[model samples]
Target: KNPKSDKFKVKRFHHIEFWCGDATNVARRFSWGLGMRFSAKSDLSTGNMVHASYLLTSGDLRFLFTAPYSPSLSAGEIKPTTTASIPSFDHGSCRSFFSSHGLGVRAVAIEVEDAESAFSISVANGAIPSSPPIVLNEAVTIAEVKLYGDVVLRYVSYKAEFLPGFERVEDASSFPLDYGIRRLDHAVGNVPELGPALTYVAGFTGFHQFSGLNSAVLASNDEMVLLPINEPVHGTKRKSQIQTYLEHNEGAGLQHLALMSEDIFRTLREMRKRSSIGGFDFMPSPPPTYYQNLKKRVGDVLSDDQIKECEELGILVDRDDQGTLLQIFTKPLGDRPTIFIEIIQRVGCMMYQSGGCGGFGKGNFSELFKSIEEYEK
Candidate 1:
């Protein structure tokens, strides 16, 4: 989550937790693919003895992935509401999750102004309290709420770590993508039902509908309600991707995460190199007509050279009088196709300065939907 200047007025995204088997190598993917390095680590060597947690950061974005040190850490019954048990390395909760979910997003952590207050408000708003507020020490207080399936929404505070406990490792040069990738843009998740998901986020988190898209990914009685009730007007259809994810994952999980970059063309260029060298896969280039019409549309906003390079690299662009938004998606991170990633960059937003639409690339929706739908086929 990006924090603003004025204290806690900003709803900051703290970090995302992924339970994995090979955090060291997945850590490699992020370092090579996004330019991040391990800022801190908590594991057996560090005295935690349960599972190893690696902290990867580029700017404000931190992705924490865990793999057990061994086996479970004495699983037990829940006592303090929805608070998850502290896993004993890989063997504990992390292992359990990895086995069941297979390296998918386990939690979405948000740094709130007050953990107790947020927890109280969310529980009252039709939320299922997973854990009562717990104080790790003077610097941290945390709580959790169960979201749709196999996922938990963690409410954390501006708590500092190592109130003398976590020994910060100086050898942080792990992720290498700092030259390009910057911060997180947004994270997209899936739920068995759409309307309830929207309601829960709005009801508890206080993030109203900012923008959205409608598609025929699902049909007949199947429908997916998008974010924002529409400042003006709107619609919804079954997002086949969501259905496909729910079925294969056996429950709801993170579908994709979007990261912002200073230079998307360069960042994507590097990512493509990784893919070519057997690193990973990304979504295929858009149709040829996609770029022909694109140049005509963004001729004044971006240079012909810029447009040409973007098309040559398969990057998508959206422009208006106020700002230009560039975006592209990646193939699934694993065999499940349950999770992927997106890279985005905003050159000028709110340039109109008043009622401007400076948001995610909803500009590329029709094409994105068509392309994704084709992939589904």
Candidate 2:
């Protein structure tokens, strides 16, 4: 049985905040490597000396890179009189997260109709409050709740720009900005347990179990936002990848973000080209025999040449009853084997379907794990 309507209305993702050790390097990596443009910033130049922040945007995708300033400044020196309305930085928490998780996601923000309403309902329903609803500049309202591990779920109601206290900047790149990536398809959180995590998230957000490795995929009402929660399998011959993430991350946290592209073939081609100059390095290609037997496994969802290109670029392909899913994973973004990215595209799955967008690349698991295992070696 299904409910007639959702408890709270969510439009889409607002942005993902990546708390890193160096905001500039990470922002540049995304700017030059992934073709995201620097849209706005907050730092000493902006009279905010407690931390450095940069907002990058490509299509509808927004990534906020934030890092705390060492030698923690006093509150008197940290606040900017000009942007008095802007909230102060929480440097203590930022440093703690950076040390614990390395470079990883701290918040997965969503666009809701009313932040107060959403937060109030969620708190009443069982979500622990990290921050109560706060109206910003009389234009936007923001709220926060503990999601899993140290990550927080942010509810934002804003018909506004990135945020206050940040100045917008034009793209300064000298190269063409066309990678075909549009927006987030999904983000998978690696947790120690799936049952409680799923129950906790679904209880608050009204997200339902939509579709797993030792996993459960939760989807919002409109199906635009999908969160796949993963846990390690017990009694395996080798340590599970999910287990590896939990250990390296030192806690439950975001594992990867699947950025949707219109044409992954073109997107992958650009990404591979960038790798030579300093872009992301994807996991090595699966064995040739895997490609040789692709047709037998996937049953001709792609042309021979298409399969050949996928092999050349180390992209994997799988399909479901709804459509096809083409995807590839990057090595960890930072020194630690913590967080990474997934370039994904779905054929015939833009709108809501019974199953989510070819489904979290389930069929490609074994080959991917084997590739990762070899990489670890």
Candidate 3:
């Protein structure tokens, strides 16, 4: 039995806003790690003294890493935590989030055919209004709504160059820019341990559960489609990755982002060449035995040389009735297993080499679960 629901169409994602400890450092990390380029920025220099923000872009994807130059104070201090103090809190919605989830996704903005229509659906369904829409210089307008915990979903309509108060800039590194990653594949948000908001937007916005009914269909990529899933919810449950994330983060947070790429083989090859992107290395190497077995199962899908290179780079492979997909994960972005990344490539679709439709399901996911669990240990 299905319910007829009103639809708020989202053509694609606009950008992800991360409340980071240091926007500059995070921007540097992305520049080196994923070959993203600095496209725009706003800060004290730009007359936006509230916080420092940087816009990094790759293909259609953009990342807004923003943080306060001022430190956040201790909670319940009568006034907001917008201050300089020991062990600092942060700022704006970021202050509360950084203290709770560490450095992670704070908002997801999407490009809609009609921003007003999307916001109307959200308002009708009782999504908490963060603020009224800001009409920007007759070129763009934006509005935001609470999306559980610290995550906000923004509706963006742009008729000009990106945001209102930001100006485009070249990447500081001056490194040549090129990568297989073209856009966002998806982003998984880890909800609270209890009282999950599970698909609250589904009925309101007419987004069907096209894939994933929970119990393991986790996937990742860039540009980012929001596919939030909650922890095991009956009376109570322990050791769920969603719960684990909520506990580690002390609230709702992003679990992972899957970055889409056209040429994953080349992408992963570049990842291995770099040692560190701001005190961070690559993800764990997939067990040799995993690929030892993969050699037999997927040998028809990829060549020995192809498999070897992927194995060396620690990429994971999954195949379907139609075609194949190759992806790789990174170790958590922070000391805590709060946030991480996945780079993906699908080789056979209208979007690519040409074939039937496909998605992120894996029949052999038990192996992946075990490996990831072992890493978390």
Candidate 4:
């Protein structure tokens, strides 16, 4: 049963909420450096808590920024670490699984036209609402439904809508405040049995199977199995932790958040500049060998100059007959070593790289693992 056939069509990605050790600092950096304008801020005196949110509009996408209440206070300061501590996996194994892989919460919230209808449809299928729909004053109402495998589908109702925003566009400086993010491209998740779990998600949610992004690990022939998820045109890959999480976590959850941008190169440049100004930096160098081998492997598909351009900018590249894309993952944020962002720029396609095919670093899981290993070392 293709869920996409009957599932509620997600209109736009609404907002994302992340718990940071230092909310104030995160808020400041994002607003001042990243060019996200402050929308609202609150200080809940019940527990010396503080929260701030930022907003940016692109085409039809809305990028939201949230910050922690108190950095000086420990986890216990807010509340005992609950099952929701780990954003991606289930409650039981959330702690250990995330700790092992150094991953953190990257939950994505999507906007829907009708919150109640969306919630009802999701629950009727196999979803469990994390929390009942709550009205945020007069402008917004939100309902969070948790999929069987720990994936979250958020239904948000809002009045004035706008696109995801970025300060830069290729070589232009005009900030398009009316822009908004379209659909949720794809959210990454980890599962023990990729094939079965992906099928389960398909059964529950209405997302279609994207074949172009399908990928498998091939360490010789023994590991030649594609990841079990809808593969977009551009594929992506990551390390599997079936053993580590199955015993600990009951099932899958979000791994990383991928945001789509109309102008990727310009967005990347803005990200770099913001990081520099905020003193928050991304991985500066990708090993030279990764680039060298990339040229040899995809040289026929892409020109030497193009390959060199990606390497120089530290952007990973992937391609299909339709078009190519540039992507890169940031080093984990916060001391927990969990939580990072994927910067992607789609040139002329609507597919996601599901950890397969594409160029060396962009589609090469081995190189990614190696890169992380080296960073840890």
Candidate 5:
């Protein structure tokens, strides 16, 4: 039987949780930088004594942040609506993960129909189980399986509630400004070995390969979940950027998240101004000739003025058979140069389409690498 035939059903991506040193500050940067609204939290004051977690939302996008407490603290209990002994925090794992990765993504959670079957099926099909299915408050059931390097793929099934341990933030203290960003487009990860990584993830999730160079883009059936994995290539005069990420991060982990924007020009213009207040700093613009030939390359998908705006704002444009894509990357968000963000706008692609809109920008790979290499120099 095909692996895809046995794959458990997934509704959509739920959230991507990062293990950080300070959850509040990380939450603030995304809020002040990307315009995501603070939605809910589980912290010391909220009865989660082991770690502090803050949830942020923008459109369908959800980013969850967690910072671990001292190991001496006991694992906190959650009093579910139905009354069960629920211990939901991963105190020990989070601390070591933070020590190793330093503000890296720890879990990429997806909403599935049945957590039990998702977990069991993946494990039965050669996946390593990190945590068994744990039901909370009789509302949400969650399970975890190893993805790559300290990261886990979370399968969350919900009957109700936003999240089990988190309480909604009701006081209108932290609000968001409009940035035109809608949801997650894709997440790119770097691993030590590319082929094995692909096999491990594809074996369970049944996500097929969409496109590739030295890297491979894997997508779910609905085209909502996209994970592009990269492994370093040898024989180059300089070390591969993917190898640099592994050395800096000390292991494989998420390299960047592509945030989808409805109007990238508007979103990038707004984001550029907030850099003084801890917003993201984007990569430098490509050479003039790259922009000079833009019209002939991607056709008239974007007008001359928009192309000029792209030049001014440092956005790179590419196209596939179906549509055009505009994208830009930020410099590493933290001191380690391990993780960053990508802002993307896709034209002429819908969610239900087989291949993702604009085809993951495969045409722009060499240009991106050269730009990064130049930046490093």
Candidate 6:
């Protein structure tokens, strides 16, 4: 049964924050690689040493990138790092969402009518307050709740809300930006040791559990281990120490930030056109056979248009019982091959598009292994 419609009122996403190791470098990469314009930078004279904050918005989506002045300290070790602590990124109390696979600091801020009322409801439901209500400035009031241990869901209310500066398509061309990077689709997080911390957060938050990706869902042919958690959908199981390390350390970071587009095929074409016109280095092309074989194997699972669409754009397609999604991963941003971007489109599915048919596809794995081989060489 469904609860009363009034019980849950969410308008749209507000904003998301990501912690970066190099704030300046991140800003440049985002500006050049994703087409996000640097709207504003805050002054650090407030004794807050607020580090660096860059605002990127397209349509209703806003992305806030914040990093500490120093990186040697873990998040918990930072001073004033509590729920009530007023960080430069605090907005207000609103329903937030995150993705699986320990990808990045991915969050979706929702617009709510009342902040205090929303806070009360969330706390009563067991969400751990990361920070109490605090005014970031005259224009915004913010608070955050830790959902599912590693996921930080923030709620922000603004005194006078207006569209983000880059929402205008024209601004994209006038400013220095990476046009390929589109709207945010999803944020992924990876946890090394799946335990109480992860379980507690999911229980408190109402994120649904997705169970189709158990051992049956893995394509590597290895035994799959499922860790028990409050939400079966978001819970993760560790298979080996390597998997644990990946989940906790490098893998634990944002796996990929999914970007969105109304028509990815067309959008990618435009990106190519711009790159050609500007003489900018274009995104690398994946192996052509990757697309050809996938089209052969997909059979009736996907429509002809979807298959042709991905093939033409060099996009990868994956599916589960719930639905299918189209995605393509960019090359690593750094030497360690730690971070990347995933451009995705959800057709009618609820599963992450890791690979097709409840598992990572051979084409995808082949590409990944090829990258690894290159890195090692």
> What TM-score goes with each of the models?
0.79, 0.90, 0.81, 0.61, 0.90, 0.60
Tens-digit per-residue lDDT, 1-377, candidate 4: 22235366556456665433344566555444334444433333222232333344344434444343334343444233321121222222333433443333434566677776777777777765676665444566667766324445566777662221212222232333221223234445545445655555455455555412333221111111111332223222433233333333344444445555555556566666667566245665577666766676557766888778777668776666555656777654445333445666555433443322332223545565565566555
Write model 1 residue lDDT over 8-81, tens digit each, in one string: 22255677778889877786676666667777777666656455677788778888876765434324423333
Candidate number achieving the greatest TM-score relative to the actual structure: 5
lDDT of 5 at 114: 92
lDDT score of residue 2 within candidate 5: 16
Kindly report which residue stretches of model 3 are placed more than 4 angstroms away from their true locations once superposed. Answer: 1-6, 71-90, 170-175, 193-196, 211-228, 232-238, 277-280, 351-357, 368-377
Model 6, residue 370: displacement in angstroms? Answer: 16
Candidate 1: stretches off by over 4 Å: 1-10, 71-93, 159-164, 172-177, 211-239, 320-322, 350-358, 368-377
Per-residue lDDT of model 2, residues 1-377, tens digit only: 23424569988888999988899999888876777878888887776656789988778888999987754453455333333223524777888898988889998988899999999999998899987887777788888999888898888898556777787774453234668888887888999988999988898778877713488878887677888889888667766888888888997999999898878988888888998687888887787766766776565678788888888888888777778888899988888887899998887654544336677778777755664565555
Off by over 4 Å in 2: 1-5, 70-74, 77-88, 170-176, 211-213, 297-300, 350-355, 366-377
TM-score, candidate 1, is 0.79
- Give the true-structure RMSD of model 4: 10.0
Worst 10-residue lDDT window for candidate 5 reads 77-86
lDDT of each: 0.63, 0.80, 0.66, 0.47, 0.80, 0.47
Error of 6 at 322 (Å): 7.1
**Which candidate number has the best lDDT?**
5
List clash counts for every candidate, in order.
24, 0, 10, 40, 0, 30
